[PDB]
Amino acid sequence: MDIYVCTVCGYEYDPAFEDLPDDWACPVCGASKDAFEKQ
């Protein structure tokens, strides 16, 4: 739909940004933004 909830810690993020570099890491688990997927 439009949500990027980490699948490691279960963080919550919304796809309403503008500058999304090519290297975002969870500000909690620290894991890469690869385990992130609609949830």
Domain segments of the chain as ranges: 1-15+26-39
Nearest CA-CA partner of 34 in 10, 12, 25, 9: 25
**CB-based contacts of 12, cutoff 8 Å, min separation 6:** 3, 5, 6
Both tokens of residue 39?
């949830």
CATH architecture for the domain at 1-15+26-39: Single Sheet (2.20)
Binding-site residue numbers are 6, 9, 26, 29
The CA–CA distances, whole Å, from 31 to 1, 8, 14 equal 23, 8, 17
Please give the Cα distance from 1 to 31 (Å, whole number): 23
Binding-site residue numbers for Fe cation are 6, 9, 26, 29
